Amino acid sequence: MDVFMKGLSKAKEGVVAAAEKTKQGVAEAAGKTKEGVLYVGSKTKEGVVHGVATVAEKTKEQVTNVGGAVVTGVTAVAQKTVEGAGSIAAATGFVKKD
Amino acid sequence: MDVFMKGLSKAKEGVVAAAEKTKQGVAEAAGKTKEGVLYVGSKTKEGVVHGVATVAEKTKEQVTNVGGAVVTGVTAVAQKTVEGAGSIAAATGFVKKD
Amino acid sequence: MDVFMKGLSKAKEGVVAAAEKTKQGVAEAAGKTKEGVLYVGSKTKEGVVHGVATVAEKTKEQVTNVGGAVVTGVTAVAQKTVEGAGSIAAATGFVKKD
Amino acid sequence: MDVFMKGLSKAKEGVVAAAEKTKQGVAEAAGKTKEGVLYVGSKTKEGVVHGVATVAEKTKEQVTNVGGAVVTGVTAVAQKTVEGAGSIAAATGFVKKD
Amino acid sequence: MDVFMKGLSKAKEGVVAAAEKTKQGVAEAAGKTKEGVLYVGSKTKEGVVHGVATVAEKTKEQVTNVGGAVVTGVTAVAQKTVEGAGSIAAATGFVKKD
Amino acid sequence: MDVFMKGLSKAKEGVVAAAEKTKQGVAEAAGKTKEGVLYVGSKTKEGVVHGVATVAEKTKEQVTNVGGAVVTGVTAVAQKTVEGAGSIAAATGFVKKD
Secondary structure (H helix, E strand, O other): OOOOEEEEOOOEEEEEEEOOOOOEEEEEOOOOEEEEEEEEOOOOOEEEEEEEEOOOOOOOEEEEEEEOOOOOOEEEEEOOOOOOOEEEEEEEEOOOOO | OEEEEEEEEEOOEEEEEEEEOEEEEEEHHHHHHEEEEEEOOEEOOOEEEEEEEOOOOOOOOOOEEOOOOEEOOHHHHEEEOOOOOEEEEEEEEEEOOO | OOOOEEEEEOOEEEEEEEOOOOOOOEEOOOOEEEEEEEEOOOOOOOOEEEEEHHHHHHHHOOOOEEOEEEEEEEEEEEEOOOOOOOEEEEEEEEEOOO | OOOOOEEEOOOEEEEEOOOOOOOEEEEEOOOEEEEEEEEEEOOOOEEEEEOOEEOOOOOOOOEEEOOEEEOOEEEEOOOOOOOOOOOOOEEEEEOOOO | OEEEEEEOOOOOOEEEEOOOOOEEEEEEEOOOOEEEEEEEEEEEEEEEEEOOOOOOOOOOOEEEEEEEEOOOOOEEEOOOOEEEOEEEEEEEEOOOOO | OOOEEEEEOOEEEEEEOOOOOEEEEEEEOOOOOOOEEEOOOOOOOOOEEEEEEOOOOOOOOEEEEEEEEEEOEEEEEEEEOEEEOOOEEEEEEEOOOO
């Protein structure tokens, strides 16, 4: 079970170059992410919200937030004359300069 | 079971160049993502919202949010004279410069 | 079971160049995504909303949101003189410059 | 990949009875057999005979045997008033004797 | 990968009865056998005979045997008033005798 | 990877009865056997005979045996009034005798 590979796997005489993701000026809020996850015979239970109650009576204002991730604010990014955020990959092999 | 591969897998004499995603000026809010997920014989239960109640009586205002991810705000990005966020991949092999 | 591959798989003498996605000035809100997901004999249950109640009586205002992901706000992006977010892949092999 | 099964496989409410082979008075010599063999991505090399030489000169007798299995003799079986070699399988289920 | 099973596999409410092989008065000589063999990504090399030479000169007799298994003799079986060699399997379930 | 099973595997409410092989009056000579063998990513080399030489000159007799297993003799079995060699398996479940 060879699952996640970046290169030579049961191979011969390879020249591999692999880059990866970049981010420049990103503002995320309450996000989830799974990159390269492998379950084998497992049993999970993720991110549930259960049994929520909320009562109001003769009140003038009520603001409630329930969740896995609550974001109530400013998530700002400001850039100016920003230069260079990149993943470079170079590979060279089996050269015969004679 | 060879599942996720980037390169040579049971091969010979390869020249492979692989790049990857980029992001420049992205604003995400309450997003989910799964890249390269593999389940084998597993049993999961993800992201459920169950049994929510909300009562109001003679109240003047009631604002409620329930969820897996609640975002109530500003998620802003501002760029100016920003330059360069990219994934480059170069590969070279089996060259005979004589 | 060779499922996800980018390159040579049971091959010989290949020159492969693969790029990937780009994003420049993207604003997503409460989105889902699955890229390269493989289930084998698994059993899942994702993203359900069950048993929601909401009562109002003699109230002047009631604003409720229930869901897997609730976004109530501004998700803005502003760019100006932004240059370059791209994935490049170059491959070269089996050259005989004599 | 459910390959060899004798019974219920992803089923419900079954009554299965399976018997198997019998042998009574059998004489085998230099035989091969494969029952329930499964190869996955494997590479084998079985039972080869390679590069055999044999020279005679002014000799009065030469008897040679080369092989994977050489049997030069008596393989005999003798039975008399022999009784009973059989595989029986009985199954009974979901009976409602009222 | 559920390969060899005798009974219930991912099932419910089963009544299974399985018997197996029998032998009574058997004489085998230099035999091979494989029952329930599973290779995964393996590499084997079984039972080879390579590079055999045999020279005779002015000799009166030469008897040679080469192989994976050489049997030069008597393999005899004699039975008389022999009774009973069998595999029995009985199964009973979900009976409601009222 | 559930490979060899005799009974309930990921099941419920089963009644399983499994018997097995029998032997009565068997004479084997230089036999091989593999029952329930599983290789995973392994590399083997079994039972080879390589580089055998044999020279005779002015000799009156020469008897040679080379192999993985050499049997030169008597392998006899004699039975008389022999009774009973069998594998029995009985199973009973979920009976409601009222």
